[PDB]
Amino acid sequence: MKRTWQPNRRKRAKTHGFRARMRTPGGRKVLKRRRQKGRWRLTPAVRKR
Amino acid sequence: AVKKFKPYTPSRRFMTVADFSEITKTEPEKSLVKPLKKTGGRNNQGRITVRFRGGGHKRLYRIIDFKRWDKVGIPAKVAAIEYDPNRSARIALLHYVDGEKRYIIAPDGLQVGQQVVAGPDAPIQVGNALPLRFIPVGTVVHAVELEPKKGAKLARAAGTSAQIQGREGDYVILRLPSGELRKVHGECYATVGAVGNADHKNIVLGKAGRSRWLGRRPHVRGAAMNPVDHPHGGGEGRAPRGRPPASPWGWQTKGLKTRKRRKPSSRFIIAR
RNA sequence: CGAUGUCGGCUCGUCGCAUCCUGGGGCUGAAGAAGGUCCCAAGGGUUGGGCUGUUCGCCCAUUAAAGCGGCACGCGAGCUG
RNA sequence: GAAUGCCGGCAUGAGUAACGAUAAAGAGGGUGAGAAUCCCUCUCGCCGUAAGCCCAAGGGUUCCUACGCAAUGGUCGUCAGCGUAGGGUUAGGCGGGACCUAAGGUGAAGCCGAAAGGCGUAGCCGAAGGGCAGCCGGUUAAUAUUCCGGCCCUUCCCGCAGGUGCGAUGGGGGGACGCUCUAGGCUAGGGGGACCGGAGCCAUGGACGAGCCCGGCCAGAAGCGCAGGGUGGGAGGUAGGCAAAUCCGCCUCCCAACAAGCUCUGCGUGGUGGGGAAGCCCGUACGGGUGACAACCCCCCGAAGCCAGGGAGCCAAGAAAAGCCUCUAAGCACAACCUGCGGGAACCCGUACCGCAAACCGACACAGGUGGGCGGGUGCAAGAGCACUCAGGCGCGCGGGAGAACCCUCGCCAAGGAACUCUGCAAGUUGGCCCCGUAACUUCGGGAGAAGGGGUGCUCCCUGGGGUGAUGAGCCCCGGGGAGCCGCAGUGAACAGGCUCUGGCGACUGUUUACCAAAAACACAGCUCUCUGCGAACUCGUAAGAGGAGGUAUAGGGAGCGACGCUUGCCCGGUGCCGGAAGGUCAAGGGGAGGGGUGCAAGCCCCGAACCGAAGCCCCGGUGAACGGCGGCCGUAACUAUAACGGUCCUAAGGUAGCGAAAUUCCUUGUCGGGUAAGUUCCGACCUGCACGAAAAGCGUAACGACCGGAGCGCUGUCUCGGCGAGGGACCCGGUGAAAUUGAACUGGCCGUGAAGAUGCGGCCUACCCGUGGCAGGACGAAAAGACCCCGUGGAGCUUUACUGCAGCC
RNA sequence: GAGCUAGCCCUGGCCAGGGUGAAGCUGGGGUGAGACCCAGUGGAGGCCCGAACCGGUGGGGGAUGCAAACCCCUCGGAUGA
RNA sequence: UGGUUCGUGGAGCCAUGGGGGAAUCUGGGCGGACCACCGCCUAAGGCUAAGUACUCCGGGUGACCGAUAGCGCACCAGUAC
RNA sequence: AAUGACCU
RNA sequence: CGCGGGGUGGAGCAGCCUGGUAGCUCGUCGGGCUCAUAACCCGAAGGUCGUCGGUUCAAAUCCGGCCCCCGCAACCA
RNA sequence: CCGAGGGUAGGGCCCGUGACUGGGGCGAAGUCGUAACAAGGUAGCUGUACCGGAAGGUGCGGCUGGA
RNA sequence: GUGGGAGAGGGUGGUGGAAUUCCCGGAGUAGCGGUGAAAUGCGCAGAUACCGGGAGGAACGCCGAUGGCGAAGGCAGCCACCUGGUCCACCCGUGACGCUGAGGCGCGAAAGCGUGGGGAGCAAACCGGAUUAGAUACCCGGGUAGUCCACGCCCUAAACG
Numbered sequence A: 001m002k003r004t005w006q007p008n009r010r011k012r013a014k015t016h017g018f019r020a021r022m023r024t025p026g027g028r029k030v031l032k033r034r035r036q037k038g039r040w041r042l043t044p045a046v047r048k049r
Numbered sequence B: 001a002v003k004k005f006k007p008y009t010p011s012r013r014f015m016t017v018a019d020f021s022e023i024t025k026t027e028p029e030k031s032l033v034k035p036l037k038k039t040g041g042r043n044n045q046g047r048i049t050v051r052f053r054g055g056g057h058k059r060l061y062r063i064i065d066f067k068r069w070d071k072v073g074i075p076a077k078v079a080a081i082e083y084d085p086n087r088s089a090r091i092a093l094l095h096y097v098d099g100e101k102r103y104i105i106a107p108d109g110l111q112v113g114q115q116v117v118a119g120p121d122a123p124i125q126v127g128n129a130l131p132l133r134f135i136p137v138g139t140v141v142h143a144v145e146l147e148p149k150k151g152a153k154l155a156r157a158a159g160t161s162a163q164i165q166g167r168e169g170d171y172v173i174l175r176l177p178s179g180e181l182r183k184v185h186g187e188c189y190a191t192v193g194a195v196g197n198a199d200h201k202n203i204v205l206g207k208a209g210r211s212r213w214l215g216r217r218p219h220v221r222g223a224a225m226n227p228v229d230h231p232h233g234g235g236e237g238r239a240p241r242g243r244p245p246a247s248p249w250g251w252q253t254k255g256l257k258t259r260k261r262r263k264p265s266s267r268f269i270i271a272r
Numbered sequence C: 001c002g003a004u005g006u007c008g009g010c011u012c013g014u015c016g017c018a019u020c021c022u023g024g025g026g027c028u029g030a031a032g033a034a035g036g037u038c039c040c041a042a043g044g045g046u047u048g049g050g051c052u053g054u055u056c057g058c059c060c061a062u063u064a065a066a067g068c069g070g071c072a073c074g075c076g077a078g079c080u081g
Numbered sequence D: 001g002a003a004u005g006c007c008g009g010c011a012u013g014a015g016u017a018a019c020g021a022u023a024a025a026g027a028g029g030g031u032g033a034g035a036a037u038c039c040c041u042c043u044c045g046c047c048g049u050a051a052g053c054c055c056a057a058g059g060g061u062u063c064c065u066a067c068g069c070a071a072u073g074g075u076c077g078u079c080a081g082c083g084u085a086g087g088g089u090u091a092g093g094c095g096g097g098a099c100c101u102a103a104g105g106u107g108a109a110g111c112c113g114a115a116a117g118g119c120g121u122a123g124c125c126g127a128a129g130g131g132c133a134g135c136c137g138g139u140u141a142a143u144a145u146u147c148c149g150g151c152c153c154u155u156c157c158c159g160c161a162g163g164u165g166c167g168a169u170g171g172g173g174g175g176a177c178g179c180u181c182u183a184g185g186c187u188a189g190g191g192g193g194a195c196c197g198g199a200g201c202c203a204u205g206g207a208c209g210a211g212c213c214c215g216g217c218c219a220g221a222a223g224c225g226c227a228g229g230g231u232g233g234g235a236g237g238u239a240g241g242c243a244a245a246u247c248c249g250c251c252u253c254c255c256a257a258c259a260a261g262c263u264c265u266g267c268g269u270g271g272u273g274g275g276g277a278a279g280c281c282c283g284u285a286c287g288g289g290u291g292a293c294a295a296c297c298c299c300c301c302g303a304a305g306c307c308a309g310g311g312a313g314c315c316a317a318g319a320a321a322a323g324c325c326u327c328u329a330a331g332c333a334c335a336a337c338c339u340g341c342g343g344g345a346a347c348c349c350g351u352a353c354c355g356c357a358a359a360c361c362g363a364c365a366c367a368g369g370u371g372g373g374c375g376g377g378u379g380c381a382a383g384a385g386c387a388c389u390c391a392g393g394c395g396c397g398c399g400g401g402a403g404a405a406c407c408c409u410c411g412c413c414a415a416g417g418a419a420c421u422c423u424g425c426a427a428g429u430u431g432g433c434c435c436c437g438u439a440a441c442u443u444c445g446g447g448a449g450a451a452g453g454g455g456u457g458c459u460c461c462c463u464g465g466g467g468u469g470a471u472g473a474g475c476c477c478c479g480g481g482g483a484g485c486c487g488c489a490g491u492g493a494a495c496a497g498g499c500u501c502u503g504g505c506g507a508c509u510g511u512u513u514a515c516c517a518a519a520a521a522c523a524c525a526g527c528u529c530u531c532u533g534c535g536a537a538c539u540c541g542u543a544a545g546a547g548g549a550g551g552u553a554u555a556g557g558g559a560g561c562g563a564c565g566c567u568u569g570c571c572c573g574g575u576g577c578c579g580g581a582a583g584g585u586c587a588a589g590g591g592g593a594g595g596g597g598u599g600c601a602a603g604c605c606c607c608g609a610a611c612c613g614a615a616g617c618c619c620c621g622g623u624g625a626a627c628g629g630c631g632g633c634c635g636u637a638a639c640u641a642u643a644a645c646g647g648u649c650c651u652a653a654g655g656u657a658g659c660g661a662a663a664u665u666c667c668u669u670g671u672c673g674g675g676u677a678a679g680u681u682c683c684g685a686c687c688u689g690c691a692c693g694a695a696a697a698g699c700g701u702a703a704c705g706a707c708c709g710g711a712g713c714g715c716u717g718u719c720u721c722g723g724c725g726a727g728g729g730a731c732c733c734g735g736u737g738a739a740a741u742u743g744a745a746c747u748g749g750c751c752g753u754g755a756a757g758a759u760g761c762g763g764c765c766u767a768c769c770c771g772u773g774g775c776a777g778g779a780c781g782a783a784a785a786g787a788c789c790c791c792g793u794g795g796a797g798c799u800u801u802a803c804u805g806c807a808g809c810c
Numbered sequence E: 001g002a003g004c005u006a007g008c009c010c011u012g013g014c015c016a017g018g019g020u021g022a023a024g025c026u027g028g029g030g031u032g033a034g035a036c037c038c039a040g041u042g043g044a045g046g047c048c049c050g051a052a053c054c055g056g057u058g059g060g061g062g063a064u065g066c067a068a069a070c071c072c073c074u075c076g077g078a079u080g081a
Numbered sequence F: 001u002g003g004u005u006c007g008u009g010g011a012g013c014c015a016u017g018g019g020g021g022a023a024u025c026u027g028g029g030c031g032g033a034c035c036a037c038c039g040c041c042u043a044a045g046g047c048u049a050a051g052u053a054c055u056c057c058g059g060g061u062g063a064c065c066g067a068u069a070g071c072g073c074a075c076c077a078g079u080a081c
Numbered sequence G: 001a002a003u004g005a006c007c008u
Numbered sequence H: 001c002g003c004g005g006g007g008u009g010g011a012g013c014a015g016c017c018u019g020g021u022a023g024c025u026c027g028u029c030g031g032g033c034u035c036a037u038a039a040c041c042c043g044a045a046g047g048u049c050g051u052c053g054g055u056u057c058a059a060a061u062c063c064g065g066c067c068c069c070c071g072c073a074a075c076c077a
Numbered sequence I: 001c002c003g004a005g006g007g008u009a010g011g012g013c014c015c016g017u018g019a020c021u022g023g024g025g026c027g028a029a030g031u032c033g034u035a036a037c038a039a040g041g042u043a044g045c046u047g048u049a050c051c052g053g054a055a056g057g058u059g060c061g062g063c064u065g066g067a
Numbered sequence J: 001g002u003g004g005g006a007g008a009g010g011g012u013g014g015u016g017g018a019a020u021u022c023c024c025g026g027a028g029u030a031g032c033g034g035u036g037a038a039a040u041g042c043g044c045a046g047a048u049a050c051c052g053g054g055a056g057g058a059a060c061g062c063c064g065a066u067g068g069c070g071a072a073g074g075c076a077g078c079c080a081c082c083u084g085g086u087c088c089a090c091c092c093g094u095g096a097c098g099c100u101g102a103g104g105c106g107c108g109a110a111a112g113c114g115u116g117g118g119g120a121g122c123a124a125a126c127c128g129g130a131u132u133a134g135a136u137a138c139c140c141g142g143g144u145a146g147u148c149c150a151c152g153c154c155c156u157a158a159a160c161g
């Protein structure tokens, strides 16, 4: 059947990107938490040009 | 007149379509004056706030003239009468000698080629606009302003009118389509005649689809729902309500008057 | 009750006798024939349809007879639902 | 030592199930340590509206090559989408960005919010939409619309040359638009040819023949030719297009009325360029040479594509902005602008490879999911259907035997033909086209493919229309008539309704429980009730604000009913809602009669009755397509039976029409009648309606229904009652090799006994040791800390005239 | 978290081929003029048959599956809600 | 209304959303309703070290662990997945 | 402000 | 089987709970109006209160045991 | 070739029968009321509509077969 | 044919006043409605009676007749338009063109049906208050369809002279 993962580079970027997270206090805290944690990747790596 | 069909299909046996014979050879509209992009959307910034809206034909807005006092004294020739997707009525395309082209909402009896004009001057004829004062008591009228210089707001639906009843210092009394008795300021413009397309009420949609074409989504009964959804939801195999009938939001829907009492508008109203 | 699947049908059977038939017998208000009634006897047999989820039952057509009951109201790690 | 404990390790089932579609394999020859599995050749099978091809998404090195097989591959592996290394992705013209706007996002001004933040006209951002200049070939192991060849374009900048008032983010025009059906002419694509070109081939009885086989194309500027799209030309007046305008708009006169003229596309043709089979020979994993100085011609079919902004009809009435054209304002008119021609300038990002899949989403080389374009030939009425088949790609990454039970999928059957069974569940019959031929009923459409029938191949003869063509040959579409041949059988294979009768429910097409319910439930037009006068009601939000609606009573919100036909009674006592400037009650507040505590006193501070006080409730009315309700007991007719009639109690009123053992009937298989040999079901009636009933509508209703019930015909493996055969598994051999479960086991029957159902206790009986294929009665078998039931002063969803608050409203 | 699912908004795309034959148009007929009736043309429809395509009706298989919804046969819709 | 031990209590003091609304030393607040008396303070502007809290970081020590422990990480870990 | 058994 | 409501003249109903009096309507009987009947008018009669027990000075009434009458309930399995 | 007839399928008319149901005719002295005929005690009759155990009543219009 | 005449003949548009009902203001009290008699009902929440203003629908007093017009049904305030039948005079024109009429077609009171509009009064059904033995009737108070309009049906009558 159709499963739940339907990859889209634009969606992933607009949805979970560094700039989206930065836009709101909710998201800014996510970066803070991930930084303090020592996460190698703050936001998902969306590729291609 | 109303177009009628033979039952060559079920739902074609009741279905019924407007007569478009008053639609003069001018079916597609007029750029310049209108259209605008019209912005379909069944809801506010976010959430739906009027249920069951959506779908249905794309539309172009015809930006019509609801304040006729710009062109006081300037007459215009009625050039055409065309279909307007965004109202029950039809619209008149008129050419002002000025050059400017406006649409007026099209009254009953309006003929193409006719002369029409607005102002204190203005022969009392179908199509003309006047401040309510100079209009003879008892004449039927439409596109009436509520307060002066604020635009036509009463009687624009197809086949509607108001009748002038009497006067009272600065106000003339109106009898509105609903039957209400209203004091409306003398200085309010209103155009003589009834609205026309009066056979609008006689049309039978005929099937479900037609409803959808006009963007009317299926309306579901409270009875059909559940207690979480509606006061009428549940219980077992059908149910008669079990309380005084209500909206989904709990207010009673048979009888409960809802106009706020202390409206300052009150001292200008005399009926139902 | 940290689970014994619960009606009926099907399939496969098997046992008890307080025997429906068939075999033996006493009495009979047993002429004969056919019955009644009791005692011995389970070795084998104990039909096909209509209605009902039906068990049961009531019919239709038969039959020597169309037996009653147990086996977790036998049988779902066998089916049916 | 136990916690269905936790992490880890190793066992059991077990060489057991399985090895992922039943499209299929066989051989010869290579390479190699090792070949069913790698390479090559011959044969066979499968796909072919794909299982072929080209894009987009996603993926990200999987592409190519060299060297390799530990692991990954469900077996093997010399092979690989795997390991190691190296190579490979070339653009002004393709796509995206130095262009535009959509929803939406953001947001200067502005508004709002305890804070965080929320809105928000302009502007910006935002694309499978608009705009914009490359076509055909050749090359690499791997890239090419990118490199190269030929042919053809577009932007800038600097020049010269020739024109003109040039000139804006501003005015206008244009861009610019639906759906259905469509004309004319073209192109893509395809069929045929005695014609042109071509290696070649006479086979096995015949054929050296208009014999077989292969191929007869592609691009192409100007200039033409043919199709078609856009569009009127003047002159005045002017108050609108938010400054101006010669532009546009409106008005009036002339001239065209036409594509005549300007243009602008498309298609042919075009200088010229390129390509160019079968077969044969070769050595590649593959390509090369020759065939060739290849030929490159004539017909026919022909689009859904092009000319495109074509045409007709319809109602539900069908984006925006830039480019572009034009107008003028500031300015400037040595600038600038247009046209021609030369030289110069033309960046950034993507380009590999997979892409209906072993490279994407499904943990997997997963029988699932994935948008667009091409998708040839022949026949079958047509077609993207079906059968076979070009091109091209596959035989699905375990094989080998055997020929049991059983299961799966499949074929056939005596005689009977639903006796099967909850039910004809399943399977069968029926089946395409043409022509006959069709009932009740009906809303006049339907019902209808009703039902029931006949024809259907091939050959020869005569003959009617068209299309392309000159009015002709052919070539291509539809027909009619007559003879005759073959077989059991002519839509000879594949694709392709069983039918009727009568009820229940819902009018209908539709929708729903993704993953057990597709329905009589939801929706539906349509009917009524009710709210709403516009800053509407209502909804969302603390607000600003937005929806409603750029709507205005023929409109919008809410509610119930649910096409249609005939209809929808009685009760306003209770509850609700609506209407009542009286009255009763009624909080804060007003008012202070009166009293209290202190002070030597002025005073200061407390209570506090009258009386004046809102909504709300009480009270008076209204209203049932508002919540709802719509009786009991006696007696009576000149045979009995029964009761039109009467008495009486009660109510707010005592159920009317129509239906009625019903999706409703307990007693109940009610009692009659019909279908049956027989009918707890079904149909028609009777009414004793436990417990129908009129918008939670009542009684009907043609049509419709993968809905539910009853019946009959047809036809059958459903059955009597099974039988045989087919293939895939099951079994045997080789290869890889799980799982749930598992206190430990040396794990028999009976009659007992025991926590009341024992392999384990007692007595007796039986029984050599160990497997293999099978069957499921048992191990209260596995699986899930029973769903039901109760318990807990456990938890949630829901309700209301439970309590108590809160929003909201008054 | 709306990359699954539900609704709506913006912008594109897709729907082989067959049937039935509404309005209208045109001709003939009828009338004082009509209504209307015949042909012919025309091509409407939550119309019919049936691929793609969207579904999921019944039965069987599958149940440590190919698959945490699949497969075969059969079936509904297929110019429209 | 909040704050204080103070939950409306005899409920003061301190802060304050709403209403009314003074005074400048013979002026004002407070000492738990209130009044008298005796006393204590000087509101409606602001700043001000140190003593105090914490441990990303460095150092020292341990009747603290010794790789199923000790931080999740002794090992290129907030990594693989 | 109702009614008047049957035939004659 | 459980529950709670009910038996009163000839008929239909009151009267009980706050024990001592049984009342309303119809019917029956006698008289009148009428030619007669009914309607109407005037008079009159009529009640072991289902039974059995006793609580009391006294029971239709209050309390127990039976008997018929009506209504409700009979659920999860 | 046609063809009597037999067969199958479907229509058309006509007759008989059917639980039950509708009204009707007729049958000396059963029931309920009083509709009509005298202004029949509400003039009657009437077409239609609604209602009522029953005659009947009422609304609307009409008639003289009433003053 | 020419010239005239009377008419509530028909269709459309417009308009007038009297009265009833409802609303508003004023003034005003203790009752009003109604019947054979009453009661239901309305009224101290300010009724009936009276005055001023407004709204609305329907029907047209006197003229009016024992009258007129029409084929019938039927037609009545006034105004204008469109429009049929008819009477007289003159004897001008045509020249037998005539009468009737199966079927057909058209019209056709009231009640009734469909769609939308309107609804003051009246009023089937319905609810009451009386009357009666009982009243589903007569009488009284309320009251809905309907009565009114547009369009489309229905086709009846003591449609009668």
Ligand SMILES: NC[C@@H]1O[C@H](O[C@H]2[C@@H](O)[C@H](O[C@@H]3[C@@H](O)[C@H](N)C[C@H](N)[C@H]3O[C@H]3O[C@H](CO)[C@@H](O)[C@H](O)[C@H]3N)O[C@@H]2CO)[C@H](N)[C@@H](O)[C@@H]1O
Pocket (backbone or CB within 6 Å): I026, I027, I030
């Ligand atoms: N009589 C013919 C038609 O039927 C009905 O008439 C029938 C009945 O109504 C009528 O019944 C009458 C009754 O009305 C009258 N008041 C009392 C009488 N005893 C009855 O009489 C009837 O029954 C008895 C026995 O049963 C028979 O013997 C007698 O013949 C018969 N007429 O008897 C008739 C039967 O014969 C209509 N009323 C009458 O008007 C109509 O025209």
Ligand SMILES: [Mg+2]
Pocket (backbone or CB within 6 Å): B044, B045, B046, B047, D540
């Ligand atoms: Mg919002």
Ligand SMILES: [Mg+2]
Pocket (backbone or CB within 6 Å): none
């Ligand atoms: Mg948002």
Ligand SMILES: [Mg+2]
Pocket (backbone or CB within 6 Å): B219, B220, B221
């Ligand atoms: Mg609904």
Ligand SMILES: [Mg+2]
Pocket (backbone or CB within 6 Å): B224, B225, B226, B234
């Ligand atoms: Mg529900």
Ligand SMILES: [Mg+2]
Pocket (backbone or CB within 6 Å): B227, B228, B230, B231, B232
């Ligand atoms: Mg609720």
Ligand SMILES: [Mg+2]
Pocket (backbone or CB within 6 Å): B236, B237, B238
């Ligand atoms: Mg129910």
Ligand SMILES: [Mg+2]
Pocket (backbone or CB within 6 Å): B231, B232, B233, B234, B235, B239, B240, B241, B242
């Ligand atoms: Mg409910």
Ligand SMILES: [Mg+2]
Pocket (backbone or CB within 6 Å): C001
């Ligand atoms: Mg248990």
Ligand SMILES: [Mg+2]
Pocket (backbone or CB within 6 Å): none
């Ligand atoms: Mg256990």
Ligand SMILES: [Mg+2]
Pocket (backbone or CB within 6 Å): none
């Ligand atoms: Mg014995």
Ligand SMILES: [Mg+2]
Pocket (backbone or CB within 6 Å): none
């Ligand atoms: Mg004997």
Ligand SMILES: [Mg+2]
Pocket (backbone or CB within 6 Å): none
């Ligand atoms: Mg036996």
Ligand SMILES: [Mg+2]
Pocket (backbone or CB within 6 Å): none
């Ligand atoms: Mg059965």
Ligand SMILES: [Mg+2]
Pocket (backbone or CB within 6 Å): C055, C073
């Ligand atoms: Mg049993």
Ligand SMILES: [Mg+2]
Pocket (backbone or CB within 6 Å): none
């Ligand atoms: Mg047995």
